[PDB]
Amino acid sequence: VVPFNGKGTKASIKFQTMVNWLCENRVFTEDKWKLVDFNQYTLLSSSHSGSFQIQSALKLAIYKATNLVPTSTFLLHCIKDNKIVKLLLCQNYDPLLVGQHVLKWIDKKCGKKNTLWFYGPPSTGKTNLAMAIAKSVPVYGMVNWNNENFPFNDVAGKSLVVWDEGIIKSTIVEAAKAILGGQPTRVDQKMRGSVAVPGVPVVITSNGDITFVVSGNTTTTVHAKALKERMVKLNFTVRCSPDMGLLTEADVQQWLTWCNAQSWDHYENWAINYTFDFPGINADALHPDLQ
Amino acid sequence: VVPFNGKGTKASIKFQTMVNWLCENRVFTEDKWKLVDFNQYTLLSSSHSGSFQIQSALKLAIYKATNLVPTSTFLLHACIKDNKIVKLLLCQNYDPLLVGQHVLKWIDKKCGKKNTLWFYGPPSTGKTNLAMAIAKSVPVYGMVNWNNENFPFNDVAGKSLVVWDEGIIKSTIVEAAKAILGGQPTRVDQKMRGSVAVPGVPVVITSNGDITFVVSGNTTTTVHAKALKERMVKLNFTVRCSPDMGLLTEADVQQWLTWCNAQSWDHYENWAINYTFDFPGINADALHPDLQ
Amino acid sequence: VVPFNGKGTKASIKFQTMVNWLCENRVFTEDKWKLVDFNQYTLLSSSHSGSFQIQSALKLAIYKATNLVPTSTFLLHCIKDNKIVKLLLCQNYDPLLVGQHVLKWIDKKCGKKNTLWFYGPPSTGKTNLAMAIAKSVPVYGMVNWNNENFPFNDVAGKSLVVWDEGIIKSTIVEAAKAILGGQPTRVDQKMRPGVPVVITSNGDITFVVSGNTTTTVHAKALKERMVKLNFTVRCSPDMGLLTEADVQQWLTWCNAQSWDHYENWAINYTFDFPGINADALHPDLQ
Amino acid sequence: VVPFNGKGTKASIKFQTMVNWLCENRVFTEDKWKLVDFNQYTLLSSSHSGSFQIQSALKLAIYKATNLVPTSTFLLCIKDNKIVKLLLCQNYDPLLVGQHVLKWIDKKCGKKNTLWFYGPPSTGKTNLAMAIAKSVPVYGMVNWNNENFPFNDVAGKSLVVWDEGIIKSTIVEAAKAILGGQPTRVDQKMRGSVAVPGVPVVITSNGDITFVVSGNTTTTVHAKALKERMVKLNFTVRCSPDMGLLTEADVQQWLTWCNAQSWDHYENWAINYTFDFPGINADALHPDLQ
Ligand SMILES: Nc1ncnc2c1ncn2[C@@H]1O[C@H](COP(=O)(O)OP(=O)(O)NP(=O)(O)O)[C@@H](O)[C@H]1O
Ligand SMILES: Nc1ncnc2c1ncn2[C@@H]1O[C@H](COP(=O)(O)OP(=O)(O)NP(=O)(O)O)[C@@H](O)[C@H]1O
Ligand SMILES: Nc1ncnc2c1ncn2[C@@H]1O[C@H](COP(=O)(O)OP(=O)(O)NP(=O)(O)O)[C@@H](O)[C@H]1O
Ligand SMILES: Nc1ncnc2c1ncn2[C@@H]1O[C@H](COP(=O)(O)OP(=O)(O)NP(=O)(O)O)[C@@H](O)[C@H]1O
Ligand SMILES: [Mg+2]
Ligand SMILES: [Mg+2]
Ligand SMILES: [Mg+2]
């Protein structure tokens, strides 16, 4: 599979440099391009043949950031002052295992446990944490934005699907089962080449148990066992301070930078047998920096 | 036929070379091209002219791979005891020599009316694994489960293989089923392509139960049972398999078919004179010492 | 009329030569072009100006081969050795007369009798002979490929229309009276010649289904437009496909024979085709 | 099974007598009742109860005539009969055919429930079929029903007549069951059993009905299936310009004579019902017709 020779001219080389510059500065939308580099956009729009190049370059940049680059590389660049590390300790979970699992999860390497689920009372910061992760990936999507009868459209081309205040109904149980489990949709099967893999990670925030499928005017539990195998459940029980504020990329990347530097032995021991719930803080193995 | 005495420019020769290169590297989709070679794709998509060239090259490469070059040449290659497929066939009591030799004719549409292979048996006996192994070797194939429920046979043309997994035939589409399973092209095929006859696509079917019985409402009917038997060939996978045989690979398929091509064809010509709905099993003495 | 004074460039003359090449080699479809000369097709498909010429040349070649050139010349290139000659002798039909009629029938010189009809028991070789002619003419079209309720789409541009094992429904009988009679469709008249039609069937086609009952209202009108041939004797399985050459040698030989015999019967075109006259059998056919 | 111990009043006995009278004179339609006896109809129509009694009597008479009595009862020197002359011209045994007609109308032929007449036009195909249809109490015609629903209101008839018929691929499935004598699903859901009504069918056509019309072409998939359920007759000989409309009297005389003769020659053919009806055997032809 040696690459074709194809010696290109300067016009194509400049376009390729622009495509690389798009990925390097995370410019994936027309609005972001206008907000960042207005002069180049104005110059490119002086002609139809120059306007076609914008639409040509954006698609290639998005595809490169989605499939040709590991997503975790966009995340990885004191520790005891990081808000997420402080926040996760307030919920009585080990920050190191959570951070280590997320990096393994975002690269679709957890196996069939593709979907994370955040559950707890309101005003515990579940939604705030989910937004920070979604803000850091190249492109993210929502189930809230999609149409009510077709909430699982526009899945392809996204690195993370966020479902806020979610709930599952019986009319969409067959679609949710495939997407939450990482199984590719038939669109990818009939567009790409047979059972592929891309799929997409999913993060869910909820104020109630989502394993209860809503059918008619009755709550049912036919699929409770089937759903649980696909998620890792976190209980956000402790209310957070009202003035914590929103989380940003610098907070998440700093937190994720520390986690990657530690040994994988602690995570890989539990990773052998995946459990529906996530283990809590173990004082016999807490990292010395967090003691 | 004397070819038209035209001569192309530098760009035309480059485009023809690119079409050949696409054929040689088994690239037939946009995603495959982006995965294999991103640089050439970017260079081609840098301008409006190249965006049309990409589509033309892909459309020509698919046609060249499917209609101009025999499919079996993509299977053969350019420790026979240890081949996984040979062991799997022996576990299910079938001769690896006859199975491989029949494929080299069925995949080439040379078997006449019997255009389909049928896999039957209990679950977890290895029906799906072998079926997908053949598919991964041919250039492009289509599986029925992708299509719409009411329209099962879309995009059948232009494919080297049709895959139907654990499917069941309904009476509402039994009329179209006898067409593809029989190897005769659909009505639209002749019209768009002028000739009353254009060969069909080979089909492979896996099933846990007898599909010769057609679903008709909430009732099973056997009126079409006779018609399916001369269009099909049956194999029985009656032995379960331990979880010690992972997914099969194209390397196993190529090695298996390579050996079957080199051996003599007398053992196949005897059966090929009058095809039988049942595929004969292992013969104790006919097994060659290379597999004894 | 004096042609225009326009002088073309190198590219235009090359395109005109390409059209002549396509017309000469009977390359009227994209699939045939790919199967015959893949190199030229790949060269042309490199850009827009090359791809447009493919469609333009195909359309011009079809028009030239259908309207500006007599179709019979496309068919003309041991007479007893030909398979078709024996086949017509078995059915008690004179090979010379039927051969001459086909040339006039394909050339629209038989007046209103624009339709041929093969009648007989099943498996008597009717479709084998009929399909042989369809592969000899430049372009042919079958009724069976068309939509069930629109059987007569894309009739213009075909050198021959074939209707195999067909039956006439009273809901569409009025359209059949036109095409089988050779009258041009009203759409052809608005935008701007008939197309020969051949019908093979097992029963009597003059009966028209009307509901769940047969009726004979249209039996009289359909008789004038058609010629009936009887294929009664079953064919041996070893005959196989009839080659386009077998038609070519048969038609070419019948062309050179004396034509005055056919003109005598041509004075009053009967619905029934006359059988073999033993006093008129050609010596070479014996 | 013992009849109920109840007793009917004087008025109910009159209605019971009226029901028997309707069956006795083959009065199954309102027009027939008006034509035959106007005084009684006018007297009955004087009020609500009399009008309702008309409907009740008609329904009960139809049921009694079609379900509780064998049809052959309504059908019950011979050289002068015109029907005998007709079959002799068509080269068929007058005695053998009549016995089959008696068994067929009584649903005693098993699967082969349908007759078929074939031949060139103007040879007596339709005339004979209508004469038999007139003799039985009630008959139905396929041509009267709607095109998309050719088999509506099949039950309740002693015979169903199909003239110049042709089978469309859309309705080929419904044709298989009814022509084969299989009961309709509608009656099974209503009556409760799995096989009850039973309807003989007679078909006359000028073309081969084994072929099924599908789209704009002919198919032979269903050819063998229909052959099992049908019997074929060839009317290949011409017929005089007059051959006056055959009457019920002509039919009744012919079948009565056939039933009187010995039945032994029939059941030999009934061992295995052949698709094609055997022709005249000049050796076995009855001496009266020799
Ligand atoms: N403007 C803000 N943006 C983000 N987080 C904020 C903001 N103001 C306060 N917060 C913090 O976020 C907490 C609640 O934010 P939110 O993300 O809605 O939490 P939650 O528990 O997921 N909410 P709920 O949707 O009610 O279940 C507050 O208690 C603060 O600690
Ligand atoms: N990717 C894989 N993961 C796990 N097991 C595999 C994989 N590929 C092959 N196998 C095993 O290889 C064997 C092939 O079985 P398979 O062909 O799937 O059987 P089957 O009867 O057609 N299956 P089913 O789809 O349940 O009807 C089984 O033992 C599988 O467990
Ligand atoms: N595909 C074929 N290959 C070889 N021989 C063929 C083929 N099709 C037909 N024949 C031969 O051609 C002769 C008659 O062919 P066929 O087209 O079936 O005739 P026909 O009278 O038009 N049939 P039918 O369609 O039943 O009316 C016989 O000798 C056949 O053996
Ligand atoms: N009104 C009539 N009643 C009785 N017989 C008639 C009548 N008119 C003509 N006939 C003659 O009766 C014979 C049969 O009549 P008919 O029932 O029309 O024949 P058929 O063979 O069933 N006709 P077709 O339906 O065209 O196949 C023929 O000799 C007719 O000439
Ligand atoms: Mg929330
Ligand atoms: Mg045919
Ligand atoms: Mg009649």
Author numbering:
A (entry chain D): 202 to 278, 286 to 499
B (entry chain E): 202 to 279, 286 to 499
C (entry chain F): 202 to 278, 286 to 400, 406 to 499
D (entry chain G): 202 to 277, 286 to 499
Give the article text.
The main replication protein NS1 plays a critical role in cell cycle arrest, transactivation of viral and host genes, and replication and package of B19V genome. The SF3 HD domain of NS1 belongs to the SF3 helicase superfamily, which unwinds DNA with 3′→5′ polarity. Totally, four cryo-electron microscopy (cryo-EM) structures were determined, which revealed the detailed mechanisms for ATP binding and hydrolysis and DNA binding and unwinding by NS1.
To reveal how NS1 recognizes DNA duplex, we performed further cryo-EM study using fork DNA-2 and solved one NS1_2-570/dsDNA/AMPPNP ternary complex at an overall resolution of 3.43 Å. Like the NS1_2-570/AMPPNP structure, NS1 forms dodecamer in the dsDNA-bound structure. As supported by the low RMSD value (0.8 Å), dsDNA binding does not cause significant change to the conformation and overall assembly of NS1 in the dsDNA-bound structure. The density maps suggested that dsDNA could be bound by both NS1 hexamers, hexamer-1 and hexamer-2. However, due to the density associated with hexamer-2 is relatively weak, only the DNA bound by hexamer-1 is modeled in the final structure. The DNA adopts regular B-form-like conformation; it is inclined toward one side of the ring formed by the OD domains. The side chains of Thr210 of NS1 protomers A, E, and F point toward the DNA, forming H-bond interactions with the backbone phosphate groups of +6, +2, and +4 nucleotides, respectively. Instead of interacting with the phosphate group, the side chain of Lys211 points toward the major groove of the DNA. In the dsDNA-bound NS1 structure, the side chain of the His249 wraps around the DNA backbone from the major or minor groove sides. The 3′-end nucleotide of the DNA is inserted into the central ring formed by the OD domains, further confirmed the 3′→5′ unwinding polarity of NS1.
